[PDB]
Write a protein that binds this ligand. Structure first.
Ligand SMILES: Nc1ncnc2c1ncn2[C@@H]1O[C@H](COP(=O)(O)OP(=O)(O)OP(=O)(O)O)[C@@H](O)[C@H]1O
Ligand SMILES: Nc1ncnc2c1ncn2[C@@H]1O[C@H](COP(=O)(O)OP(=O)(O)OP(=O)(O)O)[C@@H](O)[C@H]1O
Ligand SMILES: Nc1ncnc2c1ncn2[C@@H]1O[C@H](COP(=O)(O)OP(=O)(O)OP(=O)(O)O)[C@@H](O)[C@H]1O
Lengths: 699, 726
């Protein structure tokens, strides 16, 4: 036989004392591994560490050969989750007697009802062998009818920790509050809801979805057939799937399995059917079982494409038949993780299989603040400044991106702080080092957001349109009672017409920044994107070009034909909608009727304030005191040029400087003069006059 | 040898002595398994729990090693059908002795004439191994009834069923009445023509066509005619074809072999046809065996297609040879399920291969009602207080719903009921919450028909009260679309069919599509919307394909209505016929509405702004026979529209009689007054924001803002186009 794989399972009957340090290995396996029942053996996940618990005969033969029963206390020491691989090693080192051990309490209660006439004996009757974990749940110990947890944090006198057998008189018992085990052994710590981010709605939905079949499957089976079993997690990558599934597996006492998917299927062999059947049979063997699937889309892509694969078809068919035959009254739940909803196979994403859909939204500034505070609390904050206002400012300054590799920002900030402190103090101890915020800001700028592959100070705005934009974003939304009682349709935005080089893009960026909600621009020449507007709900949608689709050509025709369905969807929830155009005369006559485009606003060159702000922002990279520019003469000279030619001027000046004196420390007026003379009068007056005529005829 | 698989087989004789706990295993494999004859072995389907049975020596030679022999009883424990996969394990556990057991036969009234000892002697021969699933014959001498049987219920004291050891002294048998098997053991319930219904003409025909070859070959031999070889079951997806195959396999004791789609094909050359040959040889080894093929279209497509290749042609050729070759013969039947028969190779669809073709159709109202009744009776008593009229109403509310979607609807209703039980009832016991009409009414949302997924858009929620128009048009349209449906027998005796056509010509903003969208929303029948320029494509023939697909979907989705948006966009180039695309589109439209193939369920409704370009071919009776002026509405309709619009406004506070406003509204068109009211509201909220009462100032501002908008020349043209008929 040679069993090279073993699993774990909690013992029944709720054994006390004798439950610890016992591994009821099969007698055939026990004799095969030349280990006596009265001997110490190493049980644990392969290649990681060991626990050194005493093996057992196994009592009756009704138990499966592969599985060995272990108590929950031992498993929690090395974070041995249900269904983890186990390995037995014959060699053993005699454990020395424990001396001057120390014990702690997980809860905050300390020095209360210190009887110790049975607690000390408890550490002796449980077959000895004291581990740093010692998660105690046996008997009923309390002080005023309240459960408490006792942890033997440390015992100092290739495994998780050296084995020590407790002795009645050779060691002294000291009690203190630690709330955690000693960090010298660096034992794994199970994840808790305190360490993870907030995600209140998502975590609540996931908890309800997991809980509903878990505790009452009999009622679902009696009421009907095919209860919900499949749970699908999708959204943007990096938001957290492996971490949350690990958390929900740790918090549950049911059997779990790790199914990556590439390892389950054997390439060019077609053994995925047998592998999946064996996995599901093992899951069905134990009533409490959890099925975890990672990257299900990669395992089973869409069947529409001819390149999906015959092995993909086989695995889809076997998954379908196994889900059909898994039964209804069983207490089984399947959790599937996928990268994008589009890559999910359409047959799998059908009613009756994955109805309970769980999605993780893009974290906002509040979620970023919450996760930052949670991480700072988890990290040792004996020195780090709390600074709620600083955290809020950092979160607001950061561009809106999903909670991906956010801990990497803290890691690189710590690295920068270490590098600064080493040079500052000539290799001093960490306790004397100081942590600042400039390094964190520099690291955050360097790493940059990776979600895609603007600020009100960065991009200015015109005051004339500020009141109108505020009205459009507030009155329909902030006070909808008047519209509801008067039956008045929402304005549904306005039409902005202006030259490509004017401040229309600047106005759009100012609107986006003032809204405070991230958005993706929709190109003119470029159904799925439009459908996502309703699903998200509170957001902003902007169209860069509408003139092309107003009257490629096929894409423009499709967009202008589907705009009719867009209006119907937008009628129910207008929220806010804006668009831009270059040829106003191409717009449809039926699109100018009241109730869809109530008002039309003309946009032109940026004002003096916006021009000054843009000049200051583009000069921020350069220097102002050495250059001597007042940031106003340039604006006066190039007021009518365009709203974006200043970037070209700065680029030309920088290029001239770097080709005239190589590395640059200051920028002289000669480069600016050359840039100004290079390009003159980019805009045209005739097209602006046409815009003015259109504005006049509009009303 | 290394035998890693086993197959169940029946005993040649009834084996009156040892019906139960008998499994013949070859001595060679048994010796290699280190299992003695007096040792228990668990056997069961792969991926499921096993059933323990005592090992038995094989019947000398001429006995296959792979097969394991059972007699009608061990197979029925886990609903093991002949030909299913089996797995053998050497792990055995001694079971406790049985005590206080009860036996009750299904389909039989509680009677005490069994003498209570003849059944006991049968249990003595069992010699242990007592499980809740046992099926016997009880011989004879029982009320003179030949077709009776007895089944054990359970016993009151990692296996599919709990095994107990029978003892005559302490058996303590008690008689009781109960249906099928106990649900607390989660045993596989043997289904036999319970869920499938509404296709009697088809299901009994299939049953006869399956029964006659296998069970009555003597008449075929005497008549000199070859028995049927293959039956093809083709139909729309979600019609229960796989369920039909499963039930027809379960209802018979045949050696079924199942292959499901691309699960057999592989990139390795010489493997798909080898597996098919092995399957056919195994089927031919046993006379009563049945071969089942699922998704034959994806396995053996047409060779005429240029994208097929060579492996597809080879697999098609080997399938044809195995079905009918010089050396290919037997006493087997092949069942193939597919969605489209066109993709199937014509050589496969030959009377020698597939003489009988089964065309599964979309369930009708009676079939849907039968399926719903069966689904609701599946849970039997103690719930479902709804009577037959509620089920009939639910069935009538669904038109294009396939049988697959009804199970999903029931599951959604159940889960919604469970979710609602956590709210107001505050986690009360679910044994008394039962099922109400409100639950299914709420669950009716967020579910779509299987064949009506992609082309369906967001459902409008506009009713009759929201819209306002002339009563004549709405009454005529309601009567035209409801009389064939409300009273079909009246038209049957009268011998008059539906007009199937109607045209609405009028000026824009004349209340035409709104009277159609609201009708589609209220009626509840399937609705299809076709836009004007949407069908127009640069490539020639794409529009024709789209129109044909839309018409086929309408035909296959029960009687419905097709409404065209901006049908005036297509025209014969305004003079004669020059562009080929427009002429082809028009000709295809006429052919689809009325051509060689006759369609009656769907009713065509269209609205055109300018009927001048519509030729007499489209205007002839039988396509767009009905014509309605659909001009401006009367004073009452406009007054109702204004009252509905003013209903949001404080009518009591304002106190205006709006009679002069009614006249002013009559002075304009339909959408013009709505735009006037919207612009007046916008002007009011821009001038003095919210107002408790709307005065005449804002209304006059709207009147001066929007002037005219309609010219009388089109009104005169419509009047003459309505009056020149005579
Ligand atoms: N909500 C969160 N709260 C706290 N930390 C988080 C959160 N989401 C992500 N993280 C951090 O980011 C890491 C990335 O998450 P995880 O390892 O679960 O990957 P994933 O997003 O599921 O994977 P993939 O890149 O394949 O989409 C986590 O290990 C954790 O450190
Ligand atoms: N006529 C019917 N009566 C009762 N239940 C039905 C009927 N048709 C379908 N169902 C239910 O809907 C399910 C869907 O059918 P099934 O999965 O067997 O596929 P199918 O309809 O044969 O289609 P496909 O071609 O996609 O395999 C069935 O398992 C059954 O529960
Ligand atoms: N009786 C009415 N009540 C309310 N609104 C109306 C009425 N008649 C017209 N309208 C308004 O005018 C629009 C056009 O009317 P309708 O839906 O009848 O279009 P139609 O006659 O099919 O014409 P087309 O689609 O070619 O513009 C409606 O969507 C609605 O906003």
């Amino acid at each position: 036989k040679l069993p090279a794989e073993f699993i774990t399972r909690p013992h029944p009957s709720k054994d006390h004392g004798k439950e610890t340090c016992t591994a009821y290995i099969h007698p055939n396996v026990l004799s095969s591994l030349e280990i006596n029942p009265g001997s110490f053996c190493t049980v644990g996940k392969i290649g990681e560490n060991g626990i050194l618990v005493i093996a057992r005969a196994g009592d009756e033969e009704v138990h499966p050969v592969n599985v060995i029963t272990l108590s929950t206390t031992i498993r929690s020491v090395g974070n041995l989750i249900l269904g983890d691989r186990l390995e037995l090693k014959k060699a053993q080192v005699q454990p020395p007697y424990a001396t001057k051990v120390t014990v702690g309490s997980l809860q905050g209660y300390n020095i209360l009802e210190c009887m110790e006439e049975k607690v000390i004996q408890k550490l002796l009757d449980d077959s000895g062998v004291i581990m740093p974990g010692m998660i105690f749940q046996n008997l009923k110990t309390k002080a005023g009818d309240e459960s408490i947890d006792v942890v033997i944090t440390d015992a100092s006198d290739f495994y998780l920790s050296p084995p020590f057998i407790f002795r009645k008189g050779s060691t002294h018992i000291t009690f203190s509050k630690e709330t955690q085990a000693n960090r010298k052994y660096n034992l794994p710590e199970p994840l808790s809801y305190a360490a993870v981010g907030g995600l209140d709605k998502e975590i609540e939905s996931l908890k309800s979805a997991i809980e509903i079949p878990l505790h009452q499957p009999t009622l679902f089976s009696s009421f009907g057939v095919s209860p919900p079993r499949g749970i699908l997690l999708h959204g943007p990558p990096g938001t957290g799937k492996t971490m949350l599934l690990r958390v929900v597996a740790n918090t549950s006492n049911a059997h779990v399995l790790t199914i990556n998917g590439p390892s389950i299927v054997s390439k060019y062999l077609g053994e995925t059917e047998a592998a999946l059947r064996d996995i599901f049979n093992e899951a069905r063997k134990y009533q409490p079982s959890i099925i975890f699937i990672d990257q299900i889309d990669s395992i089973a892509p869409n069947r529409a494409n001819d390149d999906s694969g015959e092995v993909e078809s086989r695995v889809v068919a076997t998954l379908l038949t196994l889900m059909d035959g898994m039964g209804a009254a069983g207490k089984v739940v399947v959790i599937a993780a996928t990268n994008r909803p589009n890559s999910v196979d359409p047959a799998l994403r059908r009613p009756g299989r994955f109805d309970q859909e769980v999605e993780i939204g893009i974290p906002d500034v509040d979620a970023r603040f919450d996760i930052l505070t949670k991480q700072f609390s988890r990290m040792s904050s004996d020195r780090h400044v709390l600074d709620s206002e600083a955290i809020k400012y950092i979160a607001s300054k950061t561009h809106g991106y999903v909670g991906a590799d956010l801990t990497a920002l803290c890691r690189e900030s710590v690295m920068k702080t270490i590098q600064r402190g080493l040079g500052t103090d000539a290799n001093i101890d960490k306790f004397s080092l100081k942590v600042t915020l400039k390094d964190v800001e520099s690291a955050m700028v360097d790493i940059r957001p990776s979600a895609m592959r603007v600020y009100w100070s960065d991009i200015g705005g015109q005051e004339e349109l500020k009141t109108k934009m505020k009205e459009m974003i507030q009155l329909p939304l902030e006070a909808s009672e008047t519209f509801a009682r008067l039956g008045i349709s929402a304005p549904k935005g306005v039409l902005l017409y202006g030259p490509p080089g004017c401040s229309k893009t600047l106005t759009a960026k100012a609107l986006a920044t003032e809204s405070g909600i991230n958005f993706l621009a929709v190109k003119g020449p470029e159904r799925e994107i439009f459908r996502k507007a309703r699903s998200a709900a509170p957001s902003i949608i902007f169209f860069d070009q509408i003139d092309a689709l107003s009257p490629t050509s096929a894409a423009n025709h499709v967009l202008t034909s589907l705009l009719n369905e867009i209006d119907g969807v937008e009628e129910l929830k207008g929220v806010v909608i804006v668009a831009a155009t270059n040829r106003p005369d191409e717009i449809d006559a039926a699109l100018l009727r009241p109730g869809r485009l109530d008002r039309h606003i003309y946009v032109g060159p940026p004002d003096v304030n916006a021009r000054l702000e843009i000049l200051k922002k583009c000069t921020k990279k350069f220097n102002t005191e050495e250059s001597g520019v007042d940031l106003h003469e340039l604006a006066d000279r190039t007021e009518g040029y365009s709203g974006a030619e200043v970037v070209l001027l700065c680029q030309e000046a920088g290029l001239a400087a770097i080709m005239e004196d190589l590395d640059v420390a200051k920028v002289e007026l000669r480069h600016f003069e050359k840039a100004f003379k290079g390009i003159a009068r980019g805009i045209t007056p005739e097209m602006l006059s046409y815009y003015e005529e259109f504005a006049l005829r509009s009303g």
